[PDB]
Amino acid sequence: NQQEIYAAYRVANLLGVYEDCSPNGFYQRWKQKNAFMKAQAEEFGIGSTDHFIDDVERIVDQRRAETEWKNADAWKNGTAAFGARYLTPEMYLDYELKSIQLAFATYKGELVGNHKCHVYTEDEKRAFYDANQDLFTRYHGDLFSYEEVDLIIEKWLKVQEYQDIIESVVANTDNAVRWITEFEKIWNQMQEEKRLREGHCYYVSSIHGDDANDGTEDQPLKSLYAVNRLDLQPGDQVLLERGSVFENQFLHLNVQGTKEQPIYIGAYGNGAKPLIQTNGQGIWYQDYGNELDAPTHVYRGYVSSAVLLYDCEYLTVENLEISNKGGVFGETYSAPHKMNRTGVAGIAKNRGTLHEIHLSNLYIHDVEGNVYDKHMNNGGIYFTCLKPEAEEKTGVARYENVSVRGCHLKRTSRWGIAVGYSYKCKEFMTAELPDELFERYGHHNIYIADNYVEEIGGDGITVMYAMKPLVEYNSGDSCALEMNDRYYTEPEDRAGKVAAGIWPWKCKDALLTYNEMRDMRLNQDSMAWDADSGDGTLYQYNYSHLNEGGCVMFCLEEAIHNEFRYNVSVDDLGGLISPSGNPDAWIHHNVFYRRAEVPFVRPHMDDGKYVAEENEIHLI
Ligand SMILES: CC(=O)N[C@@H]1[C@@H](O[C@@H]2O[C@H](CO)[C@H](O)[C@H](O)[C@H]2O)[C@H](O)[C@@H](CO)O[C@H]1O
């Protein structure tokens, strides 16, 4: 709320987080950040997909072939461009609120204004450990030792002290009314600037429409059910009116454009993005048609999805707000078989390769999916491939030329953004992954960029079964919030109580670059980066800060040909690198800032093979 924002900037001013903690100060930092990214970031992947999506694999090869640290001096002096290249007002406000909280969590000063900063004693931190054992078990139920979580407990206690100061300032509320009044005007201006930056045409208006209308702008349709019944054709557009709220509704589409005449779903008019408020409706039946990589993963069942793109092609969906809240009768939040829920679900099944599906500038929040299930279409955005009715007739279900750009996810469970999990998973159960597997079964030209993921129950961003995916210029914070026994109460036989930030699964020669991940929430994993099972993963030019499981993992015997170079890690906790049973990892020409009592190699995930050389390791 407005009083909490006011309070946060009062604390920012006392900590010296920003020079100008007025509403205008906020506006100017927002404009400066967006201008900086526009001036300094790479240009590839900005603007219309038709100008770049066929070149993803080429630009990946060019970047993988780099022989020196691009703009090393900016990286090393703290002026490099990374994370999302455009921050919406909502992304940017949340980014700064997280910055202020983390600055409190690391402040060493005696006072914040008249607040005496508490010094957490060993007895107090041990008391918290003994009272919160459900936060400190690992994948197999074994406890982190107190010594392994001491500094994390201190961070958590300082974050709670920060949150208590905010509630104190809210309770004690003159120049607050002034600050809030000006902020409201600044916010409205920022919304106008964001909005400016944005076949048959069908118009839908929840307020003004009628489903008996022809769907022109003057006589728009009323509901998404009417859209679900349209025989959309190549070149058609469906435009949902800004200010619309589609209560309990959903968009479930099975439509194909062409390359020359794609279909477009987007917004028209003035005001807030149209809101698809699915509230647990929008039921469909998911069935992969065979067991997945582990026999315990759930692979069939009903799913609720706000947007379902079922065998769609040559379709862009843009400028929608989506939620998918549960809370139906009989349901509890951590129930073992709570329904899987998606914001946007993509499915390939009966059309072989699906081409040219693009998501853009979606705001997806409060998707309350099953806490546990990893590969149902469960989370903010989840694209999967199911066994075809008749693969010999219609071909392998898979993706080509697919992008997810400029999306803001907040409070989605389980996944944030996941693209590519396939019924063909058992074809990839070797360490080395020949290109032929991707030619037959895998995805091509997959591009995930300029997204913002925050407050995610599980993993932030994952790409699966793709050749040379490019995952870049994404910002994340505070993922893996539910990967602990307090929320992960009834896993049954599914295990899976782990998450990392932004990572590839069973990809070939993936490139993850120019990403930013902060404040991952403790679990056995909880690092920013994860060269997981797959072949050739490269991370370069990524920024990580205050992740509770450290900087980067190399996970087990099928995580092969891993390289980690030209990254910056600032005050990651637990331990910087997690080479856990991996066969190789080349970790070179990075910069790490670690506390003396945070080890370079993380405890219990230290028995893999790696070459660490030419790294700059600073003590802080
Ligand atoms: C090899 C391994 O244990 N990797 C872990 C990941 O778990 C795998 O994730 C894939 C995702 O497609 C499948 O679910 C597979 O069955 C799992 O073994 C885990 O998701 C990540 C992040 O926490 O790290 C490893 O723990």
Residue numbers in the entry: 7 to 179, 200 to 224, 242 to 663
Paper text:
The crystal structures of selenomethionine (SeMet)-labelled and native ErLnb136 were determined at 1.4 and 2.0 Å resolution, respectively. The C-terminal catalytic domain (ErLnb136II, from AA 242-663) assumes a β helix fold similar to the bifidobacterial homolog LnbX. The LNB molecule bound in the active site is recognized by ten potential hydrogen bonds and aromatic stacking of the Gal unit onto W548. Interestingly, the GlcNAc sugar ring of LNB in ErLnb136 adopts an 4E conformation (φ = 232° and ψ = 68°) with the O1-OH in a pseudo-axial position to form a direct hydrogen bond with the acid/base catalyst (D568). Moreover, the D575 Oδ2 of the nucleophile is positioned appropriately for nucleophilic attack on the anomeric carbon of the GlcNAc at 3.2 Å. The ErLnb136I domain embraces the sides and back of the β helix domain. Remarkably, the α6-α7 loop of ErLnb136I forms a part of the active site with the solvent accessible sidechain of Y145 positioned near the active site (5.7 Å to the GlcNAc O1 atom of LNB).
E. ramulus and R. hominis also shared similar growth profiles on LNT, which was consistent with the presence of a functional GH136. The N-terminal (ErLnb136I) and the C-terminal (ErLnb136II) regions of the E. ramulus GH136 share homology to RhLnb136I and RhLnb136II, respectively, suggestive of the fusion of ErLnb136I and ErLnb136II to form an active enzyme (ErLnb136). These data justified the use ErLnb136 to study the architecture of the two subunits/domains compulsory for activity within GH136.
